[PDB]
Every structure is written in C-alpha cells, then in structure tokens.
C-alpha cells in the first residue's frame, strides 16, 4: 500500500469542467468504457444504449457473464439525474490492479443533464460509501466489492492535474505513489462514512479570515467530491466569499453573470492576469486535537477554462452556490494529491507533482495551525 505503481501513473483523462474518467472493461468479452471518477457517489452506472452525447455504451446482451437483478434504480441530482436497471457483471481496470471483480452495475436507460456532450466518458464510478448508495445500502459499492474480494488495501489516492481543454491525472488503487507528490500528506478525519465528509474549520481570502461561524462552512456538511467540478459553498458562505473576493481582486468591470457562473470572461491566450485574483485557503480539521492544516488554491484552480476560439483563453467562475452544504470539487483537488485512506478513515492532501503555480504564487498545504473549534464545526449527525 506504499511503494511505486508505475502502471497506474497517468491513467486519468478528461476535459476541463467535464471531470476525470478512467478506462474500465466490463463484461465478457470485455467491453472497454471510459468511466468518470466520482467520489461524491457510491453507484457504478453506465449508459446502456446509443446516445447523441456518447461514443459508446454498455451492451448487456453482449456480455455472457452479465446477470439482471430485474430491479430498477433512480437518482435525483445536483446536478444531472439518471435512472436505470440494476444487475451484475465482471469488472476490471486495464490501467490499474491486475484483478477482476463481479460488481453491481446500473444500466442507465434515461437521464437529464447527466451525460456531457462529447466528454468521452459513458459511465460513473461512485467511490463513496454504501450509506448513500441507491436504492439503498444493500447495494455493494464497486470499491467495497474490490476490497472484499481481492487483496487490494482499503485505500485509493487521486492526482488530478488539469491544464474544452484536455487534462490528465493518476488514480492509485490500493497504494500511495511517492513520485506523485512532495512534502507530506496532511490528513483530515472522515467525519462519517457515507460521503467522504470532512470538517472545514476556517476559510480565508488572501490571508484574511472570512469571519463566519465554524459550522457555517459545514452546513449541512462538507464533502470531497471528484465528481463535481465547482467548489460549492452554502448560501451564506458563498455570498460572503464572492463579496470578499470582489473587494480584493480589482474586478469591478466583470459582468455579474460571471459571479453566478453563467457568463464567461476571456483574455488573449497566455495573457490571463492571475495576479489580480486572490488566493483561497481552506483550513481542515487536523488529526491531533486543536490542530488544523490549510489548503491554498490559486485563480488557476477556481477559474476553469471553457466556439471557444483557438486564440483565446476563456474562463468561468468555478465557485458556485449550494443548498446541500460545501462541495470540494475537482478545482480544489487539481493542484494536489488527495489520498482517501479508507482504512484509517482519513483524507490526506499534498502538493502533487503536477502542482499549479506561476512565477509569483503556488498551491500549498500548510500546517499546523491552531483551531479550538475542531469537531464542533459540524452541524448534523
């Protein structure tokens, strides 16, 4: 669970604002499909029929090993719903562990703003815990089927790199690749095993504290969701963040739609002015009492690229409003090497090998800071 996995290095692909997908073979013979890495859910589902937005899909009748559960599933979303028919079939990850697993699989027969026009992925891989698995906990999540049936350590780390513009990354199943990051991994406790829920103890813009109550950040919860692009903030917190950001960015001429994430802003390729944007810091509950560490992201992170003409660089505000709590999306995970230590119920963060930076500032994971709020920043149970 701690060495060098050169066969999983750089096994992730995707487009900015369209998530990261990994290649998985399903069925017999093996149907090769691109599935999005979603830590914000627990269900493994794939498109079951031809779509306009998809290059391929999962042909159940093509798989002699496929078995129908003759039961359906339906998943409301924020945003992008989907529903389908449940079943089981052999699953394998070509550029990962040399293992085969018979896992649950939801053939998606219908969806709304779920799939993305030409995102080159047809399925979703819910890596979260069964408590949030639809229809209910009885449906064993893929990764749970993985560890229960193989000798893969209960752990997986991600290295989203970024930089529609194409991107790449690494998903280490079972171990920690020590060439994907520098320094150390700062772990924050998984408050509860349903989503990868954590506790944000403090938020800052350009060093300045946001001055909001601790459990305003974790209302009704904070999660680490690779399946979400944006950095979602609860109404109050979002309202304050954008205000503080405006005040410290010299950005009085930007359209208001920009802050709502509807209208883009463009500069000439390579001429983007990062220095006019503040840095955002998010302090997470540490492992030891009273201590906390922070993660610092730059505009290169919370300003994601988006017709879009060759010569221009255009961006949309990768910070949106939420009604179900805080969601630390792909924009928060890119500059870093996030580790999901399921075995020790903790999520580590570290400056990845593909850390984002410029000749002035850089993404950073710094500690230890003191927080007397700690575990009482949560809101529900």
């Amino acid at each position, epitope marked *: 669970s701690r060495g060098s996995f050169v066969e999983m290095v750089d096994n992730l692909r995707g487009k900015s604002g369209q998530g990261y997908y990994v290649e998985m073979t399903v069925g017999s013979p093996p149907q090769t499909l691109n599935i999005l890495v979603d830590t914000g859910s627990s269900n493994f589902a794939v498109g079951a029929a031809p779509h306009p937005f998809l290059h391929r899909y999962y042909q159940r009748q093509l798989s002699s090993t496929y078995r129908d559960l003759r039961k359906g599933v339906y998943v409301p979303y924020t945003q992008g719903k989907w529903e389908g028919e449940l079943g089981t079939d052999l699953v394998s990850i070509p550029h990962g562990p040399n293992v085969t697993v018979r896992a649950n699989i939801a053939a998606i027969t219908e969806s709304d703003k779920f799939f993305i026009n030409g995102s080159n992925w047809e399925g979703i891989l819910g890596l979260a815990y069964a408590e949030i698995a639809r229809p209910d906990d009885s449906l064993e999540p893929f990764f749970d089927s993985l560890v229960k049936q193989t000798h893969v350590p209960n752990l997986f780390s991600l290295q989203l790199c970024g930089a529609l513009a194409s991107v790449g990354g690494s998903m280490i199943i079972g171990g920690i690749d020590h060439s994907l990051y520098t320094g150390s991994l700062w772990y924050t406790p998984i408050r509860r095993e349903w989503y990868y829920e954590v506790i944000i103890v403090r938020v800052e813009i350009n060093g300045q504290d946001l001055k909001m109550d601790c459990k305003e950040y974790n209302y009704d919860k904070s999660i680490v969701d690779s399946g979400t692009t944006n950095l979602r903030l609860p109404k109050k917190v979002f309202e304050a963040a954008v205000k503080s950001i405006k005040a410290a960015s010299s950005t009085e001429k930007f359209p208001d739609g920009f802050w709502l994430g509807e*209208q*883009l802003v463009c500069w000439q390729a390579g001429t983007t002015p990062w220095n006019i944007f503040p840095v955002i810091s998010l302090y997470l509950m540490g492992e030891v009492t009273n201590q906390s560490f922070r993660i610092t992201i730059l505009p290169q992170q919370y300003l994601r690229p988006v017709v879009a003409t060759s010569q221009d660089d*255009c961006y949309k505000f990768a910070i949106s409003q939420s009604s179900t709590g805080t969601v630390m999306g792909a924009v928060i995970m890119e500059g870093f090497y996030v580790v999901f230590d399921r075995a020790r119920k903790r999520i580590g963060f570290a400056v990845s090998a593909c850390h984002v930076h410029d000749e002035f500032r850089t993404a950073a994971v710094e500690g230890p800071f003191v927080t007397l709020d700690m575990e009482d920043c949560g809101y529900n149970i």
Partner: antibody
Amino acid sequence: EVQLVESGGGLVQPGGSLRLSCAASGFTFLGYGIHWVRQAPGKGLEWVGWISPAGGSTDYADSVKGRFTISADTSKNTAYLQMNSLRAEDTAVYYCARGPFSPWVMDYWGQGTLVTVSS
Amino acid sequence: DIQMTQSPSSLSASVGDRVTITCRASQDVSTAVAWYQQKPGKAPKLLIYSASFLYSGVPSRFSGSGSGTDFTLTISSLQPEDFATYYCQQFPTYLPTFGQGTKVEIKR
C-alpha cells in the same frame, strides 16, 4: 482571426448626427468588452467610451457625455456608437478596441473609421 | 482626471541602441499602466500591460517597469521595425487617459 471593422465614417455637418458600427469577428465577443477611442489627425488618443455586451454596463467620457450613446447587438457581434450634435472638435479617427474586463486595456484595435465634421 | 506626461515628445536613435521612454502620472496609479505602439496610418497595438507584463506576441526586446507615478518603457535593442509613436496609459479608477505620445525615429 481576431478583427474589428468600424463603419459609418464620413462627412458630417456641424450639429449633425452620425452612427458608427463595430463588426466583431474571430474572437469570443461575449467575454470581452468594447472600448471606443478617437484620435485627431496628428494628435494623440482620447478614450471616448466603453461597454460590456453582457450586459451594459456602459461608460462614457465627459467630452461625449450626453451626446454619444453606445449600443451593442450581441446577435450580430456588433457594437454601435450613436453620435449627436457633432461639432468640429469631434473630427478624429474613431477606433473601437477589444477590452478585457481587467485590466482595462485594449489589446486589439481596429483600423478605425475617419469622421469629419465640416461645412 | 489623471494626467499622463510622457518624455520626451520625440527622439532619434540608431539600430541597436538602448532607448528609454518615461511616463509620469499626476497621481499614484499603482501599477495600472499600459504601453502601446502605433505605426503612422495604422492602428495602435498593445505592447505592455500592468506596467511590466508583455503582451502575447510582443518581442522580448520590449521592457516595461515602474510604480506610483514613475513608469518607464525600454527597448534594449532598437530595430528598424520599431519606428512608431509610443503611448502610456492609466486605468486604476477606470477613467483611461493616455500620454501625449513619443515618436521614435530610426537613424541609419
């Protein structure tokens, strides 16, 4: 290919009205703004106005304040400049330039349209 | 209404020389400054933005610097194609005003 094309330039009577256009092409219209700048023959530059086609968000200079009215057609990728009560002092080359919301600079200028107020 | 006094109004240098053009703001304009080039008859092109950041496609021999009121544009190695009139600009309060220009002629 990034390019702006002004129009409407010509002879105008003192106290007359003229309407200049600014055809945008080859770049993401929405995402930038459009400045209007003028320059007399042999003289320097003088920022005339600005607009954000998403959505104005219009800004003028005291010189043209109350006479010039900036318009924008996002359907046609075109910014307009309505000019009224034109005096001789208004004679100048009128450039429209692409403008990043920040910094407030003009990165691509059109070759302009010459306007001459004369009897 | 901020004012921009460039200096000098004109100059003539030889190919290769180090030419420096200075611009003075009538008030602290931080770093909100730009520099344009304009060939006679042609439109102005952006060279430097935010005082010292070159625009995409602008040669390396063009250099900007300064803060507050004293900003300077420098052309380390003058070239024939650098003949033009140069302008500085301010926009900290979003009320842009340019300098009176500086025609740089070539000696041969």
